[PDB]
Each structure stands twice: as structure tokens, then as C-alpha cells.
Amino acid sequence: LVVPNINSSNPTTSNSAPALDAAETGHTSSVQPEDVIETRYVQTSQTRDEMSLESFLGRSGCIHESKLEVTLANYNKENFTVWAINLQEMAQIRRKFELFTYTRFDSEITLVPCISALSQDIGHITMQYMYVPPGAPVPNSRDDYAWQSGTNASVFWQHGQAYPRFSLPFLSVASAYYMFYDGYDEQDQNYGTANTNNMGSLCSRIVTEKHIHKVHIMTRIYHKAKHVKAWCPRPPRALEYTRAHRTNFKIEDRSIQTAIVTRPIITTA
Amino acid sequence: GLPVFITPGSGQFLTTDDFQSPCALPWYHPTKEISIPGEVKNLVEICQVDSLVPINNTDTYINSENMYSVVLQSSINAPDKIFSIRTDVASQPLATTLIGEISSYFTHWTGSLRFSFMFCGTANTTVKLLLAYTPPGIAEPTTRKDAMLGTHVIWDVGLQSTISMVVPWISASHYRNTSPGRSTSGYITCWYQTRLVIPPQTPPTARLLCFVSGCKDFCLRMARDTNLHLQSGAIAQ
Amino acid sequence: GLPVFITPGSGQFLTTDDFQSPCALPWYHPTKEISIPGEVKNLVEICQVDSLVPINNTDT
């Protein structure tokens, strides 16, 4: 994928001015180096490959860290996490995508389990990760029948097993994931992307049965966007994100701080 | 068992890898795609658009529109500077402009730049400015003489509000750092060529706007995290 | 899964190996190369030059 090259230019003395235009039009004015300056002639190699959509979002990033705290005692009762699925939680990522009003793509989810040991030993730990679709029965105990995962997609990970990871086909029931949403509920409520981008929820639970060593599971979740398209680019996020599925941004008793650096005087940068 | 051999690197997760991976939803058939206006393929597409430059970023105008405009005086009768800015796309204040912001996601860049200026004063108001880019290797030109020896463009406001002018990519090297050190791409000073002139009964000040976009020329590389934006402390669900 | 078989040596790092390895900067396009006087290909090229011998190396 190449960039045009630069052509020798010459001492114009034309009745035709290309430099003079009007932005009113709403158009970006078409003027190139040569147009305005006796230029050289340059063979350009420069490549936009990397500047490709897939090249951008086609990189794995973190979207969620789901910490589970092992409690020996009531073992079969707690010791399970839940996460309402979405990307709106981890700026880095969020912002990029929030670059466009719609996006379509499959997702490669990659996992990173971390065992923070608490007793002088770890023992043998086994995790389960059931992706639970909206409508599917939500587990309510480290032993909910739900972890029979008879139709659901569940993936298992143990101490020593290499990072798990899988692939997921663009979901949603419309052509694209909505990045933003100027609309409400069937009940005029919840003005938010939140209306749609319920994807279901992710759930983990240690399989290893009642044992000895108190410990902590810190499974981090990572996501690469595959086979990508997007439309209607929007200006980037300017400040910190407050909450998910909301554009909100005004913060408890603190300045509206952009990114713009201020200066003394315009006649000096 | 096919005699195989394990490779240094194996078993390692790499955020920028590219491997296949089983699907969690076999036999799934994604919503058929549809006719959806104004798609996008390659970022550059963006950088090739005119974003407004926050030229006036004094603590004074900092959180209003007025930072985007520059004011001119009918009372100024001389070769006076009006404003200047560093060139590096992710230089201030450019940085925050579409292109600047995009660039801020890559480490490298090269190309020429398209700066456009729009006069806004009454129709009967005339003027002649001088837009000058001065090659790095030297320091901000202090006089108009000093300025105009470099690449420049005498702008006559008459009928067509705007006038685009270019910053020719002019580097020792091919690409340049999106994040510059003490190294610069020169600057773009703005001067009074004539004198903003009005009739009797007319506003004596004039708004002047400034935009930027990348040329057929422009190009970015080395994908990296943006700095023009942060997250300290978690987001609520 | 293709029935495969792990080989003595595997998983070992060797400073003089020669394997492929994923790129950290996909879709990157390195600065085009240019006309650059007096290159070099094989060291010998050097050894084939006259260096001065420090013949007189007395403490003096």
C-alpha cells in the first residue's frame, strides 16, 4: 500500500490560484507541495500498511482484570466472579475504537491467570471460565449446576498450563457494534450504548475442591480485534473516562483538564 | 509422532502476535453485513482532514472556542508578529488536532502538511498577511525579514475566505519522531504584510482561524500508545 | 491435533540459533535504504587492509 511521490514543480505565474479556496464548503482544500513551491522530484517508499485499520485495532490490549479471592470456608458458595462483558472499561482500548461511530470485527480473547500465593504453598489450582450469554443461567456458587456448561463455552486453565486464548465471531444482532448511541430504552431510559452492548457476561470459578492454602486469582483479559471494518470517525476522547457506556466526564470537585498545554504568548511556542 | 522441535520463544504471549485460535462459537453465522455510509480503511484517511488548530492557548482562552481564533487589529500599522507554532505534528498545540492526535499513536512520521487560514472579518475588511514556515536548524525568526527568507506565502484576503499553504516535509532523515526531543521541524510565524484595513462603521478586530491536514505526502509508522490522554483510577460500570 | 513429538533440545535458548520470530511492529515499513558510499559485506575485506604494526613496544 503506497504513498504517491513528489513531482518536480516549476515557477507558476498562473491566472489560476489552487491555494486559494474556502473551507466553508466543508471540504478539505486540495493543495499539494508542488502547487505552492518549486519542488524536487522524490521517489517515495513510505508505506501506509501499518496505517491500516486492522493494523491499528489488530493489536491485543487489556479490557478487564477479574480478581477472585479464595475463601476456605463457605468454599462451595463463593469463590466465583462475574463480569458484564464490554470494552468500555479500559481507556487505552476504549479510546481507539471510540475513534469511530461503528465497528465490526471478530475478537481474539487472551487470558493471563496470576496466582498470588498466601499460604507458604500454592498447591494445585484449576480455573474455569464460562462465557455466559444474556439469558443463560448465571452461576451462584462455586458449584452451580451451571458449570456443567452443557451448551455454554467454557475454558479451563491450571497452574503450569500456558496462557489460554480463543476466538470469537463478531456477535451483536446488527451489522456492527455501536460505539455510541444517541438513543434510549423501550422505556425511555438509560440513554447509552448500554442499551445494546449487553453481550452477556464472563464467569470464572476455581474447580480445585475444598483445600488448605488461602490464595488469590488475578486473571487478566486481553483482546485483539480481527477482520476489521469501521465507519464514521469521531473526534478522540479529550479527557478521562468517568463511567462505562456514558460519555460523562465532569469529575467530583476537580478541574476540566484537557491535554492542551497552555503557553505564555502566541507569538512564541 | 512427528519428530518435532521446540523453539525459543514458544509458550509466550505477545500482544502483537498473529496466530489462529479455536472459535468459542462454532457454526455461528454473524449478522450479514450491510450498506453503511462512509466507511474507513486506513487511518491516514483521517489525518487527511482539516482539524482546527487550538492556536490561542494562553491560560486566557484555554477552555473556550476563543483559543481557536486569533484576533487582528485595524490599529496595527507595522511588520508585527501575530503568532507562531512548532511544526512537529504532535508538537503543541497541533498535537491535540485530529492529525496530531492520530500521530500521537505512532513513533514515526513523514510528509508535508496543509495549513489553511480563514479570515472572518466583515466582507468590506481587507488585509494581506504573510504565512511563513522556517526550516529548523535555526531559531524562531524575530523580524519579518528573518521570517520571509524561508518558505512562505503572501496571503491576500479578498473574496475567497481561505488560503491553504504547505509545510514541505524537509528533513535530514526520512521519518521523524512523533514525540520530539529538543529537535524541531521549524515553526510557522504569522506577520502583517499590509495592515488590516476597514471602512467607517466597521468592527476594528478580525477573527482568524487555522487548520491542519496531511498531504498526499504524509505518512505514519511504529504503532504505539497515545499520551494525549490518560486513565488514573478505575471506570465505573 | 497433528500427532507431534518433542525433541531433545527443545525450549532451550541458544545465542547462535536461527529461527523465525513474530514481529513486534507489524505493518511497519522501514526507512527506504539509500546510496551510501563504501559499504562492507565480509570482514576479510578488512584484514585485507594495511594496518600499522606497533613494532617498537618497549616501555619506552
Binding site: 508505506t47 486492522e54 476466538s167 | 489462529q20 485460535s21 472459535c23 462454532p26 | -
Partner: peptide
């Protein structure tokens, strides 16, 4: 099935559309 970028082989070992590697341009 092998090609030229910015020669190597690459068929899809996987049966599902999503399973597959990063697209081309």
C-alpha cells in the same frame, strides 16, 4: 497457499471463519 508482504505459507488449520489469522488489504 503462500504470498508476498512489506515468501511464506499460510492455510487455515481452523474450521471456523473467526479462527483465522489477521486479514490482508
Amino acid at each position: 497457499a503462500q504470498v508476498s508482504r512489506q515468501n511464506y505459507f499460510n492455510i487455515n488449520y481452523f474450521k471456523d471463519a473467526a479462527s483465522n489469522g489477521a486479514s490482508k488489504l
